[PDB]
Amino acid sequence: PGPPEDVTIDEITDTTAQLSWRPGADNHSPITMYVVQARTPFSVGWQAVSTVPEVIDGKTFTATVVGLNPWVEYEFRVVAANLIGIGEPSRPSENRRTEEALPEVTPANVSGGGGSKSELVITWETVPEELQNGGGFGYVVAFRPFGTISWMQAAVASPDASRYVFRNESLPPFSPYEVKVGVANNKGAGSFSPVTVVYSAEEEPTRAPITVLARSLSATDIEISWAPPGRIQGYEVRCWRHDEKEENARKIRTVGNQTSAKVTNLQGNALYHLAVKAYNTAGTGPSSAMVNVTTKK
């Protein structure tokens, strides 16, 4: 058997396409069967497809291919079969894109967090092109503060996107948000991912430590304590000698709820200046008042 010719896509729908071929070299024994194979940007080589009629005899020359993927560029080719063997494939038809259809798949791994002041960061995994099922693909990000009713939809019109940031100066710091994302193309809208909870961005502490105490333990050691007045991971206390500039100040940081520290490796009979700030991940808050201590001799 030998290659058929003149493969054409007569009509095409969102899931089907009508094909038409003309028979070619059939060696000597008659043609008993025709099969259709398809190729896509996602296919490894040529792939078999379902057809109506379910089987294409040698006397049939048009069929509908069924079960195609919406909004995908398809190539087709037809292979003849003889009682002696399988023929050579025909040359591929011209590439045609299927019609549009609604999107069915929702983005994966919706999460987020972080960002600059007064922001809310939402992330997701981008939906691949084969599953976008239409042009004009985009994402719908719906969010609301935990315990509230009304939603807020933002449309992210880039199909390749995987991130959305909402900024507004009335945003509470490090606050919880219900978040879900969805998909939509030109035909309409898809469904939504499951609801997850994303926390807004965090700001540095707003108040400064109070009632700073400081006493010299030895010629090289100074003890310093304070009281706490939003989240606080610890405290940064800085310390610089009188003759040195504040820019270069020895800084050491508290981790935990402890409200004191010891500054060591100092010079004997020297005046030092110390103050302590609160800090979170966002940065250092305001500085407490300054205290002045001279080490022992």
Residue numbers in the entry: 598 to 826, 833 to 900
Any passages from the paper?
Because CNTNs are tethered to the plasma membrane by a glycosylphosphatidylinositol anchor, they lack an intracellular region to communicate across the membrane. Finally, structural analyses of five CNTN–amyloid pairs indicate that these proteins interact through a conserved interface involving the second fibronectin type III repeat of CNTNs and the copper-binding domain of amyloid proteins.
Introducing alanine residues at positions 751 and 752 in CNTN4 resulted in a fourfold-reduced affinity for APP. Residues Y781 and E786 interact with H137 in APP, and changing these two residues to alanine led to a 20-fold weaker binding (KD = 115 μM versus 5.4 μM). Importantly, this difference in binding affinity is not because of any gross structural change brought about by the introduction of alanine residues as evidenced by comparing the structure of chicken CNTN4 with a mutant that includes all four alanine mutations. Overall, these binding analyses indicate that the interface identified between the FN2 of CNTN4 and the copper-binding region of APP represents likely the arrangement of these two receptors on the surface of cells.
